[PDB]
């Protein structure tokens, strides 16, 4: 591969890592628009616009977990806002459901989720973290929200 490192199981990119290789130009620079990095079954991060993936170690930078995501583990190794992956992005986290305090089961029923207005809860959880809620899909518990940077 021409610079990019991604080996953690379950992770992928759109375009695929193989496609990113061929996109690399004569001077070895990988610039792509609308790039996505995801982990099958847990979520993904969509970066609208052009980004320079040249010599980025995505294994060390991007971390997608259940109901959680991290980009750049420490602030010291983080580039300024607008450069690298520290920029505007749309995050999707899957398997996001509340737990019934009586049965201790996950609440996946759309009607039940509308009863407790889980969507409004996720709007609040987004603002409190500096993000803007976008939508929620009960069938898969997909919580989509935009972030100004990481």
């Amino acid at each position: 591969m021409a610079g990019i490192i991604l080996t953690k199981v379950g992770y992928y990119t759109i375009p695929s890592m193989d496609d990113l290789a061929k996109i690399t130009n004569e001077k070895g620079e990988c610039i792509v628009s609308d790039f996505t990095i995801g982990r099958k079954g847990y979520g993904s991060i969509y970066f609208e616009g052009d980004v320079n993936l040249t010599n980025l170690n995505l294994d060390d930078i991007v971390h997608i977990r259940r109901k959680e995501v991290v980009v750049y583990l420490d602030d010291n190794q983080k580039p300024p806002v607008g450069e690298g992956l520290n920029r505007k992005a749309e995050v999707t986290l899957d398997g996001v459901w509340p737990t019934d305090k009586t049965s201790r089961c996950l609440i996946k029923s759309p009607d039940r989720l509308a009863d407790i207005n889980y969507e409004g809860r996720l709007e609040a959880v987004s603002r409190k973290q500096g993000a803007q809620f976008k939508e929620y899909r009960p069938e898969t518990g997909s919580w989509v929200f935009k972030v100004s940077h990481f």
Partner: protein, 409 residues
């Protein structure tokens, strides 16, 4: 009678003039016939004698003052130490000795120096963003004083004053990330009353009964946990955490989110009060199971008894069936007149739940808005709340945002 002249004492002028120059605030505590008022600007206590003049008071100085703001003060069970509780630290002050016919500190000197010791100082400087969410004393009146600290890392640590930098016990309950489980973190805890428990509960043997205290832990999302603490027999790293306690009956709104305060009333079976930022108060009976469950006997909406503010809960020294709630709108008193109907044998089986349900349909608690702090422009929370226990009638002291001393009744 001090109920008459205390609001005119100069200490409130002093504190009021200190204004012109998050945790819920409580800058006052009482001991004997004395009232202690924390003066943030001078990092000292102003002590007013209530029993036995408007200008007279003692100043108890910190030999080594705290540099972080003190939000709450908390007298120890043995009453020889005061916890100075802030967001960015905790400091313990040792009270000086009394002597003289009036039992004044150090014979009535105008100013008395008090020894202080910081607690868990490493955790608040090493991790800059680590904050204190809740603190209390281990309830024992016999053992060395121990403070219990819940920090923003979702960990509870217990410290002896003999080793204030090294926890005697740690309870891992399990910000760089974006997360949907933002409420899976502890915001408060409260100890229940003394209980005798089998020594086998802590892994040791002999079929012998030991002293322990139930520790109830409240998550922001409203979930509750329970563990029994014995400073002698508990392991250094406590892992026998029970919960989340199932909450019965099933509620359409799942009892919401945004829980902010918990109180264990001193009764058997234990009864928990869970308060939310929206003004919801849940009265929960702890039913024995090995995981116990909660039966929400009733719910009270303070928004109706008059709302997005932090709510603080206070026990009543006289009656286990009464507690008080402080918020930006003032003080509410809540009387659970049905507490005395619940017997000590109650369990968590179906027939017990049905009996509790049937009983809740013919019993209701008494809620009263006893003090109103609502402004004419932006509401402000109170700074102090204390119930002076007198058998001839409890007197309540409430210090407003401007250090006005309201007394009830």
């Amino acid at each position: 009678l001090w109920q008459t002249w205390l609001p005119n004492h100069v200490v409130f002028l002093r504190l009021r003039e200190g204004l012109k120059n998050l945790l819920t605030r409580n800058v006052v505590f009482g001991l004997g016939g004395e009232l202690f008022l924390w003066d943030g600007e001078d990092s000292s206590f102003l002590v007013v004698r209530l029993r036995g003049a408007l200008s007279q008071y003692q100043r108890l100085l910190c030999i080594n003052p705290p540099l972080f703001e003190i939000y709450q003060v908390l007298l120890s069970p043995t009453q020889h130490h005061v916890a100075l509780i802030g967001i960015k630290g905790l400091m313990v002050l040792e009270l000086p000795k009394r002597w003289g016919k009036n039992s004044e500190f150090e014979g009535g000197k105008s100013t008395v120096n008090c020894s202080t010791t910081p607690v868990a100082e490493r955790f608040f400087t090493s991790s800059t963003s680590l904050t204190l969410k809740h603190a209390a004393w281990y309830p024992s009146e016999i053992l060395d004083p121990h403070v219990v600290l819940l920090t923003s890392d979702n960990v509870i640590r217990i410290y002896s004053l003999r080793e204030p930098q090294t926890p005697t016990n740690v309870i891992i309950l399990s910000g760089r990330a974006y997360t949907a489980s933002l409420g899976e973190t502890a915001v408060a805890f409260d100890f229940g009353p003394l209980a005798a428990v089998p020594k086998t509960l802590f892994g040791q043997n002999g079929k012998d009964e030991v002293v322990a205290y139930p520790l109830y832990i409240l998550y922001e999302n409203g979930e509750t946990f329970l563990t029994y603490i014995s400073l002698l027999h508990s392991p250094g790293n406590i892992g026998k955490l029970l919960g989340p306690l199932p909450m019965h009956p099933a509620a359409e709104d799942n009892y919401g989110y945004d829980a902010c305060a918990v109180l264990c009333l001193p009764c058997v079976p234990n009864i928990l009060v869970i308060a939310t930022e929206s003004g919801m108060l849940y009265h929960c009976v702890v039913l024995e199971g090995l995981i116990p469950s909660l039966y929400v006997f009733e719910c009270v909406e303070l928004e109706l008894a008059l709302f997005s503010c932090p709510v603080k809960l206070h026990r009543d020294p006289k009656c286990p069936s009464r507690y008080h709630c402080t918020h930006e709108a003032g003080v509410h008193s809540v009387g659970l007149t049905w507490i005395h109907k619940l017997h000590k044998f109650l369990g968590s089986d179906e027939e017990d739940k049905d009996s509790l349900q049937e009983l809740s349909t013919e019993q209701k608690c008494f809620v009263e808005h006893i003090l109103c702090t609502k402004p004419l422009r932006q509401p402000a929370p109170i700074r102090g709340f204390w119930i002076v226990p007198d058998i001839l009638g409890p007197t309540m002291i409430c210090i407003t945002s401007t250090y006005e001393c309201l007394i009830w009744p």
